Amino acid sequence: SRYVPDMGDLIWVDFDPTKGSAQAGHRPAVVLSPFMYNNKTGMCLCVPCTTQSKGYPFEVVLSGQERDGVALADQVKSIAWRARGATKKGTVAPEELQLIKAKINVLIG
Amino acid sequence: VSRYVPDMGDLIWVDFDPTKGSAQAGHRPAVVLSPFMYNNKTGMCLCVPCTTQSKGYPFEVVLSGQERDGVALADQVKSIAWRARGATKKGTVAPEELQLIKAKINVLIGL
Ligand code: NA
């Protein structure tokens, strides 16, 4: 019984050791794609989170989580969740997932 | 001189993922999904990568042109810092090709 991400999961992935980031491991993300796709492909679409808001319009506030952070809705990316050590830390509020998706929807159409 | 700003539906040549792969196959084509105003203002764009080799995967969208067909990998959306990493324009996809790419993404993250 290994974890497979589902939509709305707040996940931590290991930082990418090839990027040369000064920040330690653990990059938080919100999973957008559904379990069936994630499970059959080993990939998922997700948006990265940051603890520090800057007041940019695609930021979505995530409340109630262990820490206060924001999802960056415009920064959608496909990740190989297996290879990135995805671990579920929590779930975002349905209103928060919905808002992330709405912003992306408007951006892509 | 001003830099080319990717527009929605453009096919760009971009260093798609410099941290990985070879320095010979690093630059690849990508289809731009986000609107001009966003791309211009932010220096970023959402795009999907293209490949020369189809495999019959369900998120492949055929790109048909006057020189060698390709496929866009519609589920592999990525945000790219086009302004910082450099992007150049290779062409523009058909309205129908862009529409199919977006319909496929809609399956995964729409509503
Ligand atoms: Na310029």
Swiss-Prot record, chain A:
Residue numbers of ADP-ribosylarginine PTMs: 2
Cellular component GO terms, alphabetical: protein-containing complex; toxin-antitoxin complex
Domain of life of the organism encoding this protein: Bacteria
Record's protein name: Endoribonuclease toxin MazF
Family membership noted in the UniProt record: Belongs to the PemK/MazF family.
Subunit and partners: Probably a dimer. Forms a heterohexamer composed of alternating toxin and antitoxin homodimers MazF(2)-MazE(2)-MazF(2). The binding site of MazE and ssRNA or ssDNA are largely overlapping; the presence of only 1 MazE molecule inhibits mRNA endoribonuclease activity. Binds to EDF but not a mutated EDF (NNGNN).
Membrane-spanning residues: none
Induction of synthesis: Expressed in exponentially growing cells. Induction has been reported to occur after amino acid starvation in a ppGpp-independent fashion and to be Lon protease-dependent, but also to not occur after amino acid starvation and to be regulated by ppGpp. Also induced in M9 minimal medium and by chloramphenicol treatment. MazE alone and in combination with MazF, represses transcription of the mazE-mazF operon. Fis activates transcription. Part of the relA-mazE-mazF-mazG operon, there is also a second mazE-mazF specific promoter which is negatively autoregulated.
Entry's free-text remark on domains: Loop 1 (residues 17-28) effects catalytic activity while recognition of the ACA cleavage site is influenced by loop 2 (residues 53-61). Alterations of loop 2 generate new cleavage sites in addition to retaining the original cleavage site.
E.C. number(s) listed in UniProt: 3.1.27.-
UniProt GO BP: defense response to virus; mRNA catabolic process; negative regulation of cell growth; positive regulation of programmed cell death; quorum sensing; regulation of DNA-templated transcription; regulation of growth; regulation of translation
Practical applications according to UniProt: Can be used to produce large quantities of a single protein if the gene coding for the protein does not contain any ACA codons. Up to 90% of expressed bacterial cellular protein can be the target, which can be produced for up to 4 days. The system also works in eukaryotic cells.
Region (Loop 2, involved in substrate recognition): 51-59
PTM notes: (Microbial infection) ADP-ribosylated by enterobacteria phage T4.
Loop 1, participates in catalytic activity: region residues: 15-26
Chain segments annotated as coiled-coil in the UniProt record: none
A Pfam cross-reference name: PemK_toxin
Regulation of its function: (Microbial infection) RNA cleavage activity is reduced when ADP-ribosylated.
UniProtKB/Swiss-Prot annotation, chain B:
Induction record: Expressed in exponentially growing cells. Induction has been reported to occur after amino acid starvation in a ppGpp-independent fashion and to be Lon protease-dependent, but also to not occur after amino acid starvation and to be regulated by ppGpp. Also induced in M9 minimal medium and by chloramphenicol treatment. MazE alone and in combination with MazF, represses transcription of the mazE-mazF operon. Fis activates transcription. Part of the relA-mazE-mazF-mazG operon, there is also a second mazE-mazF specific promoter which is negatively autoregulated.
Any single Gene Ontology cellular-component annotation: toxin-antitoxin complex
EC main group: hydrolase
Applications (biotechnology): Can be used to produce large quantities of a single protein if the gene coding for the protein does not contain any ACA codons. Up to 90% of expressed bacterial cellular protein can be the target, which can be produced for up to 4 days. The system also works in eukaryotic cells.
Domain notes: Loop 1 (residues 17-28) effects catalytic activity while recognition of the ACA cleavage site is influenced by loop 2 (residues 53-61). Alterations of loop 2 generate new cleavage sites in addition to retaining the original cleavage site.
Keyword flag Chloroplast: no
Stretch list, region Loop 1, participates in catalytic activity: 16-27
Summary of activators and inhibitors of this protein: (Microbial infection) RNA cleavage activity is reduced when ADP-ribosylated.
Organism: Escherichia coli (strain K12)
Reported phenotype of the disruption mutant: Decreased sensitivity to dramatic intracellular increases of ppGpp. Cells missing mazE-mazF survive high temperature, various DNA-damaging agents and H(2)O(2) exposure better than wild-type cells. Cells missing mazE-mazF produce more P1 phage than wild-type cells, while introduction of lysogens into a growing non-lysogenic disruption culture is lethal. Cells missing mazE-mazF show reduced biofilm formation, and survive antibiotic treatment in log phase better than wild-type cells. However lag phase cells disrupted only for mazF had a lower survival rate than wild-type cells.
Gene name of the encoded protein: mazF
Recorded family membership: Belongs to the PemK/MazF family.
Record region (Loop 2, involved in substrate recognition): 52-60
Pfam families (alphabetical): PemK_toxin
Designated name of the protein: Endoribonuclease toxin MazF
